[PDB]
């Protein structure tokens, strides 16, 4: 009955809202300071969110006007610093906060993520997530030296493989009780629990063991961030929780029911699969208060970056284009004009009252089908920080939001105690014995 709701953020300057970095409250430039991640995670944990969620890029928003130098201009996702490394700083200050984490299956070999996943489930005592994705920037591709440039659906086979690779070292290498301790006998593991994996596929040749000991979850728990017809089927397969685009109750209800009926044939529960929407809130005691804090925020919107955001995201150059061309069924001039206004992205935009939010909150939840959120910011901290002073204790009156944690690892925070590993019905399971 408890909305799960997520801290959407990235280590980088200009993540969603462009241009708000000129915002006279904001902490954008504190990016580089690792206290400004320390003071938000515990920020987080004061308003019992579930997981702080941290999206990424290794490629270069230089679509737009064919170059990235209103990327760099704007701080439209450059610089931009390294996510995983944020991790153990944060988990350090916190006891209940976890943490996703996105990183693609296209550049890096899985046998260093799958130690670096480990490691941090280990580090945080099984509160680590892995949002997984493809990646659709050009300059990564060029940049990590890739001889043949894998197509859209193509990737998302890569991927496919990527998890198989890391499924196998972090479920069936190392058997439950492979480390025993055992001075008397001097074992400190059984070597006959460690096992290879024997992997051989198109993409991947690991012969394993996997260089770690068993953790608290194994596997971290699986996002999902992707929503062509691919990455809707990847999701059904092997995600725990899909990060859904769409800022109605009838496209993301279709949404849910789309992947939860994709998620039949790979012999999944689709209960087993939670359903997040983003949401942006600008919350106020008064309408007015809210109204205000949304007029301050639109005189620092720059259409510019969010022009360099849009091209990158879509392949769409539209500098490239009349007013007066069509892309959608959408001219150009209007896809333009709808950017230049805060809610007219992808994301619910909530302004009100804490009674308002909440309203709109759980209409998403009750009407789509949805199980929690992840909140985008305007200003740092002060999306969060209003959100947790004004919303958080209304969802709490109403029985729609935690009061305080339940114990366990993050997978048992959302599929229940006990839950720890990976569900029998998931694909994972396989490698167990
Ligand atoms: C809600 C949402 C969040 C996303 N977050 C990221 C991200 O943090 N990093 C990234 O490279 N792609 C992100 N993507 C895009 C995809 O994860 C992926 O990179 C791919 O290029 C697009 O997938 P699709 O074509 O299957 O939708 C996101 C997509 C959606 C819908």
Not at 238 to 249: I, M, R, Y
């Given at each position: 009955?408890?909305?799960?709701?997520?801290?959407?953020?990235?280590?980088?300057?200009?993540?969603?809202?462009?241009?708000?970095?000129?915002?006279?409250?904001?902490?954008?430039?504190?990016?580089?300071?690792?206290?400004?991640?320390?003071?938000?995670?515990?920020?987080?944990?004061?308003?019992?969110?579930?997981?702080?969620?941290?999206?990424?890029?290794?490629?270069?928003?230089?679509?737009?006007?064919?170059?990235?130098?209103?990327?760099?201009?704007?701080?439209?996702?450059?610089?931009?610093?390294?996510?995983?490394?944020?991790?153990?700083?944060?988990?350090?200050?916190?006891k209940?906060?976890?943490?996703?984490?996105?990183?693609?299956?296209?550049?890096?070999?899985?046998?260093?993520?799958?130690?670096?996943?480990?490691?941090?489930?280990?580090?945080?005592?099984?509160?680590?997530?892995?949002?997984?994705?493809?990646?659709?920037?050009?300059?990564?591709?060029?940049?990590?030296?890739?001889?043949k440039?894998?197509?859209?659906?193509?990737?998302?086979?890569?991927?496919?493989?990527?998890?198989?690779?890391?499924?196998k070292?972090?479920?069936?290498?190392?058997?439950?009780?492979?480390?025993?301790?055992?001075?008397?006998?001097?074992?400190?593991?059984?070597?006959?629990?460690?096992?290879?994996?024997?992997?051989?596929?198109?993409?991947?040749?690991?012969?394993?063991?996997?260089?770690?000991?068993?953790?608290?979850?194994?596997?971290?728990?699986?996002?999902?961030?992707?929503?062509?017809?691919?990455?809707?089927?990847?999701?059904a397969?092997?995600?725990?929780?899909?990060?859904?685009?769409?800022?109605?109750?009838?496209?993301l209800?279709?949404?849910?029911?789309?992947?939860?009926?994709?998620?039949?044939?790979?012999?999944?529960?689709?209960?087993?699969?939670?359903?997040?929407?983003?949401?942006?809130?600008?919350?106020?005691?008064?309408?007015?208060?809210?109204?205000?804090?949304l007029?301050?925020?639109?005189?620092?919107?720059?259409?510019?970056?969010?022009?360099?955001?849009?091209?990158?995201?879509?392949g769409?150059?539209?500098?490239?284009?009349?007013?007066?061309?069509?892309?959608?069924?959408?001219?150009?001039?209007?896809?333009?004009?709808?950017?230049?206004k805060?809610?007219?992205?992808?994301?619910?935009?909530?302004?009100?009252?804490?009674?308002?939010?909440?309203?709109?909150?759980?209409?998403?939840?009750?009407?789509?089908?949805?199980?929690?959120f992840?909140?985008?910011?305007?200003?740092?901290?002060?999306?969060?920080?209003?959100?947790?002073?004004?919303?958080?204790?209304?969802?709490?009156?109403?029985?729609?939001?935690?009061?305080?944690?339940?114990?366990?690892?993050?997978?048992?925070?959302?599929?229940?105690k006990?839950?720890?590993?990976?569900?029998?019905?998931?694909?994972?399971?396989?490698?167990?014995?």
């Open positions: 009955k408890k909305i799960h709701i997520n801290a959407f953020e990235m280590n980088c300057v200009g993540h969603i809202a462009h241009g708000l970095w000129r915002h006279p409250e904001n902490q954008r430039h504190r990016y580089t300071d690792l206290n400004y991640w320390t003071e938000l995670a515990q920020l987080l944990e004061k308003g019992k969110f579930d997981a702080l969620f941290l999206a990424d890029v290794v490629g270069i928003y230089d679509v737009y006007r064919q170059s990235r130098d209103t990327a760099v201009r704007e701080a439209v996702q450059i610089p931009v610093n390294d996510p995983l490394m944020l991790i153990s700083a944060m988990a350090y200050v916190t209940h906060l976890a943490f996703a984490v996105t990183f693609s299956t296209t550049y890096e070999h899985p046998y260093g993520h799958a130690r670096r996943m480990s490691t941090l489930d280990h580090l945080t005592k099984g509160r680590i997530a892995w949002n997984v994705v493809t990646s659709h920037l050009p300059s990564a591709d060029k940049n990590f030296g890739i001889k440039i894998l197509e859209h659906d193509e990737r998302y086979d890569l991927a496919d493989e990527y998890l198989e690779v890391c499924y070292l972090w479920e069936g290498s190392w058997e439950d009780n492979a480390v025993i301790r055992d001075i008397e006998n001097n074992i400190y593991t059984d070597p006959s629990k460690v096992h290879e994996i024997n992997h051989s596929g198109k993409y991947f040749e690991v012969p394993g063991p996997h260089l770690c000991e068993p953790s608290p979850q194994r596997t971290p728990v699986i996002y999902q961030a992707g929503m062509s017809e691919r990455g809707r089927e990847f999701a397969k092997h995600a725990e929780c899909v990060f859904l685009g769409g800022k109605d109750v009838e496209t209800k279709f949404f849910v029911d789309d992947i939860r009926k994709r998620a039949k044939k790979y012999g999944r529960n689709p209960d087993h699969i939670k359903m997040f929407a983003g949401i942006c809130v600008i919350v106020g005691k008064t309408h007015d208060e809210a109204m205000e804090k007029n301050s925020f639109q005189k620092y919107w720059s259409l510019e970056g969010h022009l360099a955001h849009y091209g990158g995201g879509t769409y150059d539209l500098s490239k284009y009349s007013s007066n061309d069509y892309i959608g069924s959408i001219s150009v001039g209007e896809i333009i004009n709808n950017m230049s805060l809610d007219g992205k992808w994301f619910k935009l909530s302004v009100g009252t804490p009674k308002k939010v909440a309203d709109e909150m759980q209409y998403l939840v009750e009407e789509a089908g949805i199980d929690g992840n909140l985008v910011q305007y200003v740092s901290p002060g999306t969060f920080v209003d959100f947790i002073e004004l919303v958080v204790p209304e969802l709490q009156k109403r029985g729609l939001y935690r009061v305080d944690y339940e114990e366990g690892t993050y997978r048992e925070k959302l599929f229940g006990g839950n720890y590993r990976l569900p029998d019905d998931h694909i994972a399971a396989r490698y167990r014995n």
